Amino acid sequence: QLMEKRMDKAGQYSSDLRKCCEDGMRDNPMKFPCQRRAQFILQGDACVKAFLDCCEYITQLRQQHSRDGALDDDIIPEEDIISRSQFPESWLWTVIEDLKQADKNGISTKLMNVFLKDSITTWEILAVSLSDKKGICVADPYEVTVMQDFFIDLRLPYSVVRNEQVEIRAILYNYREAENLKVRVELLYNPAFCSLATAKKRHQQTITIPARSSVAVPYVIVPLKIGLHEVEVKAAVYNHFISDGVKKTLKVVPEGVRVNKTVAVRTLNPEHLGQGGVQREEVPAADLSDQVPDTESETKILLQGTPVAQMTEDAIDGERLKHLIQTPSGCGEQNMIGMTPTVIAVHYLDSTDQWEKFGLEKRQESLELIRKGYTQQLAFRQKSSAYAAFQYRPPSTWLTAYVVKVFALAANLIAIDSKDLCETVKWLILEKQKPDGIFQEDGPVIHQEMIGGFRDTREKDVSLTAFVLIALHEAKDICEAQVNSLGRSIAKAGDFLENHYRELRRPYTVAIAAYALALLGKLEGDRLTKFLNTAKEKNRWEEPNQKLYNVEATSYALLALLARKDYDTTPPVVRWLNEQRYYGGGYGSTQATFMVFQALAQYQKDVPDHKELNLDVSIQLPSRNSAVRHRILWESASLLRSEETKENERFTVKAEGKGQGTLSVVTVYHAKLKGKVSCKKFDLRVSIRPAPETVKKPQDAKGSMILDICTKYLGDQDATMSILDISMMTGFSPDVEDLKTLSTGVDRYISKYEMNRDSNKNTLIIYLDKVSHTVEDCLSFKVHQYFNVGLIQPGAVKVYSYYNLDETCIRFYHPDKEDGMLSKLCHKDTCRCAEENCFTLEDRLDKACEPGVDYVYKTRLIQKKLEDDFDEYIMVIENIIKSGSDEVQVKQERKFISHIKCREALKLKEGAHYLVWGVSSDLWGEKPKISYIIGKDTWVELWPEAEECQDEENQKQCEDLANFTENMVVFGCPN
């Protein structure tokens, strides 16, 4: 009765206006009112008016049928429907040529033993022959049906956390229609796990699966180690030879978020930066104040012979190409990582004749990468040969220009469709160029620097007209005879930037318009002196509160100076751009990385003063007795040499010789939650709560929750292109139908969503067109828990601007303390097996004098700090029984840290006294503040108070503790 009037109202509208009305009648998960959902509509006023009419229709009609319903709405017909498309991959892709053995008829026979795959399906083997005397012949199909009747499915998470506790299901299927199956199922022992299966006793269960049915068998597993660990479950059918085993790898990600940290980037040039020909650089130790307990750090020192040596060697390698950029791809500009660094690395090694170092195939392997990125970038090509950043968005003039620029460069290396390229060019001249030379942006704005801000109508469209003009100048020769308007449009854009150059004030806009004029030879006169005087300290074109945008501006400026053949002015600009590697030793975003690679390779292209390279670099680590030495010459194989250390120490790099080079120091560690409290330019609020019981949940989903994420930008304009990086908790995965509703509609709230594989935890990436600087932008969707987890570790939502990674803010989310989500899922022995990591008079003297025991204290617990990952126990040392490596005093506070497993193992009381001794490897941090680790070689014993020692049950223990204290100070340990 409710789907009835919903389609009669939608029948009132026709063509594309009906899609606006039907989207007005859909449910919205945040429950925005109909006027708020209208604010996200990008189609124009006719679509909004049809949206509001149909939205407020069934809003008041549902509230009328609910207020008289005392006395599902599953209408998504689609009319398209996506059918089954995932089938097992084809195999047996061979050609047999050994068929010469003839019979009476000349028929040749081949026997061939092949192994079937694990797919329970009907395989079908197809054959086409070709004979030099008989021609072509296609055989009839031969069907091979694979069916075992009993099969096991092992349900693992994407990832668990070390010392987090999960329930793992093996679902066992039995389809004999009327015959039941009694099966014994066994979980195999793994010493990296902790479960009911031990080394001396297997965990067997005996079940009976009914006919045409399935039975799930749960297994509770605690991972104890970090890394790729296998889960193997075997089961065999009783009184039969039917047996199956399923082995799957359970990735146990380390606890905390993994954070890279650039410690130092330095230019290596002892001719110019050396005193007496000897350059000395001191690299400090990294700030590891927010490190996760019981994880290792790893400092990577990188020496590069040229400042373009990392980016060239990583753009040829296919797996190394994806790790230049620190942001996700999968949208229109961002997908150009498959093309733009590989194009200018091949163009660099073209102009310098350097493929003799690499393999002979290494050019042809890198040519295949640009062909793949051409096929990937063609997915964003719309119907009018224009390019939009997402699949159902209006086309971006900024993007469509940037596709013309990279396709014109790749046309010299790869076969790019010239007709499609110049049809994309012809769309830019005709549809988007104003008659005064201005290129207009009618799609949603992608890059921040494409808006002329406020009551400065000066600098309006100057950065965009320059960006299109650089792109059309790259396709000048390619689309020459194809478009007869390209020569006039390039000149009209060049006249607009030249006439409006005196009005420019921002360093990006001065620099990007200079390179557009330098390609036309029009950076002379007052355009030249304004461009040079804009630069701070004769080496950078920067503006405060800008990072990556400043790197783009200085790269556009370096390309402007190199186009002017100003080779004497460019070496300080080259050295500055060489050391702006703030994000893991690289440049973080895409447009920053593609611009500084182009500008630095252009310097080494036409100033080939690198043939006299003879750089002798020496690194002196304090942890090593001998200083590492490396010599980077011009011919000497790889132009990059690296060193790794596990110690976070300061060290000194000493460089001698000739040439200009790069030092890079990046520390990799796992960071807790304290260092993520800082938020810059963004504002973020995350909250999670259990869903209502009337909510439809999946069949394998045990519970459901509602995740609310609200964000707001703290700038003077809206933040164009931001990303929500949302990690799921262990066992959780988001509702696809909520995210499909938020991404497909005329009231579109999410540009695109994707699940990021090869990551630490299960991460949902949400792409946003904007983040409002006036109103808080909220979105809600459901997440579903798929198995019981004993000690859930919190998730993480990180918002950031895509083009400025400094403008970020991270928040963490965990459910309630009342959820039963912190309660240990183990029983008793499995609990104790998980408490080994947590932690009689001669016994105390021996255990306090074992080789490795550093300190013995009597402490008193003042305060617990129960956090999400670890527990802090602030204790006052009331007596020092054995002095250790940490210089403590009596009644001095010290932090004792144990895992959230050990909250039930220790059962500490606040105010109570304790006898604590541990090892020196469990000391952590640097003085003046050392943190203590309650580890597996740490002793925790309750010391009763002086009123509790008067009881007869405690009097023997207090005499044993007083005899232990006097023996260990007066006599110590035996020699």
């Binding site: 059918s83 068929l99 053995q101 083997i125 694979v146 997915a379």
Partner: protein, 640 residues
């Protein structure tokens, strides 16, 4: 005596073509020389062969010529010709023939017809010549987007792989979705582009599949109860579905989707079964003209969103193309000849189809007026032999289906018109080749009936019939079938070998001197199907015991039987893709569909005159008395 020369009307360059030479009434030994010259100058003898005509070969011999592909013949401006000259002692016979080098066939097989992003397209290109024998040439292979942009252009030589170009391509994760095209052409012939297409859709993982099975495979527009559609929902692992289906119907108006909003019903699904009925009053009112006749020629689509009972997953499916007609059959006269012979039976070949185009099997068809009744076979074709009268009037034939439980207003009915053969000088000298309809396999023997009808003074002058067998546009077998005086029926037995697949034409004739002293030629032809088999042999069987169900990871032994020296390309595909998009998958019928388009005949038999029989079947004639055929310019045949 009369000398005759019969060649195919298009001769292929670098090819073995057969010239028929025959001396009607020859005596002694007649030396015949066949010379091929360039057109129109005859400056160069392109081919030169010799034979003799005597009593031992019955004054009938064949000559194989091979015209070389010279640089003058390879010129791309204008259709070229050659001049074939046969010299029967002192009498020369000369005919100008159209030529074409051809030798272009490229077949493309994908491993499957639907793909996800990230999948690997395994594709093979088979490079054969005009005789379908493997050639080693350079092929340019292009993969294009659904918008047509080339993303991969390969060049591979099939000289060392001996004609099986085996390649692969990885689909990227972000890509155009739609119908992709592979294109291939030889290096020396870029204008002969051969293509296969495949589809790229996105990842779909249903927990349960939904099948929409209508009660009939069509909707009767005058059915009072309506169209019942069974909803079969089951899991992919085999179990049944309990829940709730939301079903909506609609009308597909050519290229127009009309959602019937008043047909939206809630149907429970219990043990994987449910039913949604589209009532007739919803169908008439929902379409804007409420006419039963204005719904004929349209189709019903139906969409259904099935939810599990725990609210857990919804999977929606659609069944499109359910036609709203009154007749479930369509009669087609496409496989029948267009010309009949007077006072001799006319072998009418009625092709009956379902409304989706599939052949309608075991359907009884009755001709109106003559009451001949036959059944269709599995190919949808029925044979009805209609006994014609001794008249040269056009024969109007109406065929009607007569299947029980179908009303007479709902029976398929179509009308055609057959035309008579024109004899020389309005004479009664006829020939009819009568062939039984067997699905002819290689190894069966076909008895061909040679029926004579002449005036009683002209009967004794006919001593033999001269027959010619053509297959794949080449003369396959020529012989004579002798005849005693008084034999009005002569039978030639014909063994079908593997060289007759897929189809062959038998053309036969006799000559005589009539009552006016003039040389008369009377001819006839017939087109015969051969069962789609293979010129070679290729079987894949089990090598071990015939196990019905196998286990995962089980080793099996494959027995592969092929010709000597044959190279066999293999692929193991899941069965669920093979059934999905069958129009792009390489089948054995699709080999025989391609060579069936390359033929030099247009009609399935007979003709306007003696020159009408040779020209319609793909031959040409030149005699010493002046009997000849017209010139061929176009290899194709016209259609409106």
């Amino acid at each position: 005596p009369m000398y005759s020369m019969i060649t195919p009307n298009i001769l292929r360059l670098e090819s073995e073509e057969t010239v028929v030479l025959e001396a009607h009434g020859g005596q002694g030994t007649i030396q015949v020389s066949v010379t091929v010259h360039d057109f129109p100058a005859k400056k160069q003898v392109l081919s030169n062969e010799n034979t003799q005509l005597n009593s031992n070969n019955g004054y009938l011999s064949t000559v194989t010529i091979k015209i070389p592909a010279s640089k003058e013949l390879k010129s791309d401006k204008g259709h070229k010709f050659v001049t074939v000259v046969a010299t029967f002692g002192n009498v020369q016979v000369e005919k100008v023939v159209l030529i074409s080098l051809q030798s272009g066939y490229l077949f493309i097989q994908t491993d499957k017809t639907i793909y996800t992003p990230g999948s690997t397209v395994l594709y093979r290109v088979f490079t054969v010549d005009h005789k379908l024998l493997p050639v080693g040439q350079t092929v340019f292979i292009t993969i294009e987007t659904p918008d047509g942009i080339p993303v991969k252009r390969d060049s591979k030589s099939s000289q060392n792989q001996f004609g099986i170009l085996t390649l692969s391509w990885n689909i990227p994760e972000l890509v155009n979705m739609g119908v992709w095209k592979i294109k291939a052409y030889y290096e020396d012939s870029p204008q002969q582009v051969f293509s296969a297409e495949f589809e790229v859709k996105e990842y779909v993982l249903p927990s349960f599949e939904v099948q929409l099975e209508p009660e009939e495979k069509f909707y009767y527009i005058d059915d009072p109860d309506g169209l019942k559609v069974n909803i079969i929902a089951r899991f992919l692992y085999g179990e049944q579905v309990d829940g709730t289906a939301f079903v909506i119907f609609g009308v597909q108006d050519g290229d127009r989707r009309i959602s019937l909003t008043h047909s939206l019903t809630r149907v429970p699904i219990n043990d994987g079964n449910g039913e949604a009925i589209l009532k007739r009053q919803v169908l008439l009112n929902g379409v804007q003209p409420s006419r039963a006749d204005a719904l004929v020629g349209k189709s019903i689509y139906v969409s259904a969103t099935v939810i599990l009972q725990s609210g857990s997953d919804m999977v929606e499916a659609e069944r499109t193309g359910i036609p709203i007609v009154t007749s479930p059959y369509q009669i087609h006269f496409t496989k029948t000849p267009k010309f009949f012979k007077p006072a001799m039976p006319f072998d009418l070949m009625v092709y009956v189809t379902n409304p989706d185009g599939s052949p309608a099997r075991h359907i009884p068809v009755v001709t109106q007026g003559s009451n001949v009744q036959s059944l269709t076979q599995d190919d949808g074709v029925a044979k009805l032999s209609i006994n014609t009268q001794n008249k040269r009037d056009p024969l109007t034939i109406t065929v009607r289906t007569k299947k029980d439980n179908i009303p007479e207003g709902r029976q398929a009915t179509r009308t055609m018109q057959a035309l008579p053969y024109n004899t020389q000088g309005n004479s009664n000298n006829y020939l009819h080749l009568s062939v039984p309809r067997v699905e002819l396999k290689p190894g069966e023997t076909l008895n061909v009936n040679f029926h004579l009808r002449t005036d009683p003074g002209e009967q004794a002058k006919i001593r033999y019939y001269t027959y010619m067998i053509m297959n794949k546009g080449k003369l396959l077998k020529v012989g004579r079938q002798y005849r005693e005086p008084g034999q009005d029926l002569v039978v030639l037995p014909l063994t079908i070998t593997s060289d007759f697949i897929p189809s062959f034409r038998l053309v036969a004739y006799y000559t005589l001197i009539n009552a006016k002293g003039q040389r008369e030629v009377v001819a006839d032809s017939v087109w015969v199907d051969v069962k789609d088999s293979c010129m070679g042999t290729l079987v894949v069987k089990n090598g071990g015991k015939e196990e019905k169900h196998h286990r995962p990871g089980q080793q099996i032994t494959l027995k592969i039987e092929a010709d000597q020296g044959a190279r066999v390309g293999l692929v193991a595909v899941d069965k669920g893709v093979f059934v999905l998009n069958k129009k792009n998958k390489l089948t054995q019928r699709k080999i025989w569909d391609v060579v069936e388009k390359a033929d030099i005949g247009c009609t399935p038999g007979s003709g306007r005159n003696y020159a009408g029989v040779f020209t319609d079947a793909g031959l040409t004639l030149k005699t010493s008395q002046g009997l000849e055929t017209q010139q061929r310019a176009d290899p194709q045949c016209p259609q409106p």
